[model samples]
Target chain A: ETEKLIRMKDEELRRMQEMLQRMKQQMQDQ
Target chain B: ETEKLIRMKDEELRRMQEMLQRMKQQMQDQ
Candidate 1:
């Protein structure tokens, strides 16, 4: 199986990655 | 993460927007 379970359509993935990053920071309360 | 739905920073992805999760959960149900 692919190490990464998720993927996006290039740009979408980039956007989501960004969004996810923000989400992560939020989780850390950073 | 159904399909991960997003590509994100590994460590960061785990952290998420509490508000968003709540919203998503709310949308999932009452």
Candidate 2:
């Protein structure tokens, strides 16, 4: 159960990271 | 400025990412 929780959090973090990357790139292009 | 906001967000995301990496390693070692 703990492992699954950790895995879910990891996924969430990765998703946020991807969004941040996109925003950062857009900012740079401006 | 929007650019500055994005830069700040990028930095914050990176910091969180490092924390996530550390947790991931710990979970794997368990």
Candidate 3:
């Protein structure tokens, strides 16, 4: 999805699902 | 700005700003 990821951080919501996904994955891995 | 989008309008750039929320809502409803 890297090519598809537009990196629209300025328009990001505080509760972004992607952020949650990354955080969850990091916590699980740790 | 709008000249770039196939359909993305000016309101799209301001969607998250609460200060212009009413204007955004009006633009979206149209």
Q: lDDT values of the candidates?
A: 0.50, 0.62, 0.41
Q: What's the CA error at residue B2 for candidate 1, in Å?
A: 24
Q: What is the TM-score of each candidate against the true structure?
A: 0.36, 0.49, 0.26
How many angstroms is residue B28 displaced in model 1 relative to the true structure, after the best TM-score fit? 12
CAPRI rating of model 2? incorrect
Candidate 1, chain A: TM-score against the reference: 0.62
Candidate 3 regions exceeding 4 Å error are A1-11, B1-30
Q: lDDT tens string, model 1, A1-30?
A: 333444424444466557666755655552
Residue-level lDDT tens digits of model 2 in A1-30: 555555555676678778566655655554
Error of 3 at B12 (Å): 19
Ranking by TM-score: 2, 1, 3
TM-score of 3: 0.26
The collision pairs in model 3 are none
Candidate 3, residues B1-30, lDDT tens digits: the string is 323431243344445344344434544554
Clashing pairs in 1: none
Q: Please rank every candidate by lDDT, starting with the best.
A: 2, 1, 3
